[PDB]
Every structure is written in structure tokens, then in C-alpha cells.
Amino acid sequence: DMYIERAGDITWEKDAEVTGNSPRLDVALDESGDFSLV
């Protein structure tokens, strides 16, 4: 049995650290809900 517990509000953080790049990928989505690269 799974249960849920609250972890915070849904809010923009002005003082957030910024990371991660922005790749453009060509992908396929199969019937099982999985993305694959092409």
C-alpha cells in the first residue's frame, strides 16, 4: 500500500540555482509510454 505525504508548496523560487543545458532531440514515443532516441 502506497501513501502520500506533503513536501511543500508549488512556488517559483527567485533565488534558485540555474543549471542544465537545452538539447534538441529527435525521439519516438512507443505504445508503452517510453521515449526512444532516433
Binding site: 500500500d1 508548496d9 508549488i10 538539447p23
Partner: protein
């Protein structure tokens, strides 16, 4: 508890208490990814949340009602992943989405790597609206993870 916000999804079928994912409560509906719960019933303290809508292909599921989140990446702005990693506090990470280009159209994607139990963490726009959930994506040449910004359809 049905207060709006971000929630951990926990199980005890394994060792100790394990976080299997994350979800968003909004307007009395709990939203998460299909692969987190596989459509299973959930417990909130003394109450019970049962599934209302789900789709494996989208990898989303809603509890107590229909999908309520309808905001979308404006295209241009940077976004924030409100990551809730297992055993760690909720943390905002700001990033500029990349793009998954499919035969069916383009989807924003975030190149951020978190443990599997972070699946379901909301991505938000600057005005605070949830524009999708994290945790369904690909692993690319270098070996790091890129998650789609996975959003449902309201009404």
C-alpha cells in the same frame, strides 16, 4: 490531507519506507506519473484516493477527479523543476528546456538528473503554474538523462 502542494509517494512493500515518486495536489485532485503508482490506490492519512483517469502512453494518472493541470511551457521562458528527491528536501532548480521533436509535434524537455523516486516532481513556469511532470524521458549519448515536460489535457 488534500491541501494543494507537492507530495511524496511512499511505499512499505520494500525495505523501510521507500519513496517511489512525487505528485501534485491541485483543486482536490492528485496528479502523478503512471509508472509511479501503476494506477494503484493511494492512502492519505486516514482517507483513500482512488484512480480517476490514467493513460500509460502519456504516463500520467489522476486521483479523485480529472486532470486539472493545463498550463504549458510558453516556449520561451526558463522554468523550474521543483525536485523532491527521496529523503531530501524539496528544491527548486531553474533551467532552460530543450525540445523533444516527435512526429506528433514538439515537447519541452529538461536536462536534469535526479533519482528515480523523483518521478512526478512538478515543472513550473514563472507565474507558479505547473506545466508538466518530470521523470519520463531518454538517456542520450553522454549517458545523462533528459526528461520530457509531460502534461495532460484538461476537461
Amino acid at each position: 490531507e488534500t491541501t494543494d502542494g507537492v507530495y511524496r509517494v511512499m511505499t512499505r512493500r520494500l525495505l523501510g519506507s521507500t519513496q517511489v515518486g512525487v505528485g501534485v495536489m491541485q483543486e482536490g485532485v492528485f496528479h502523478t506519473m503512471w509508472h509511479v503508482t501503476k494506477g494503484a490506490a493511494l492512502r492519505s492519512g486516514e482517507g483513500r484516493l482512488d484512480p480517476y483517469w490514467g493513460d500509460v502512453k502519456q504516463d500520467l494518472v489522476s486521483y479523485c477527479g480529472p486532470w486539472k493541470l493545463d498550463a504549458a511551457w510558453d516556449g520561451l521562458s526558463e522554468v523550474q523543476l521543483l525536485a523532491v528527491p527521496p529523503g531530501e528536501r524539496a528544491k527548486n532548480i531553474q533551467t532552460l528546456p530543450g525540445i523533444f521533436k516527435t512526429k506528433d509535434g514538439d515537447i519541452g524537455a529538461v536536462a536534469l538528473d535526479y533519482p528515480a523516486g523523483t518521478s512526478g516532481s512538478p515543472i513550473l513556469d514563472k507565474c507558479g503554474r505547473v506545466i508538466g511532470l518530470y521523470g519520463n524521458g531518454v538517456v542520450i549519448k553522454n549517458g545523462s538523462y533528459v526528461s520530457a515536460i509531460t502534461q495532460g489535457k484538461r476537461e
